[PDB]
Amino acid sequence: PGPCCNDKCVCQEGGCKAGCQCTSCRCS
Ligand SMILES: [Cd+2]
Numbered sequence: 001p002g003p004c005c006n007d008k009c010v011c012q013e014g015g016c017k018a019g020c021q022c023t024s025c026r027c028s
Pocket residue numbers: 005008009010011020022023024025
């Protein structure tokens with residue numbers, strides 16, 4: 001159970017989660 005973009009920038013759609021550490025999706 002990790003974050004969302006640990007191995008999947010899921011912002012392009014809606015796969016992210018309440019743990020966006022990645023830096024390639026302007027989540028909020
Ligand atoms: Cd991302």
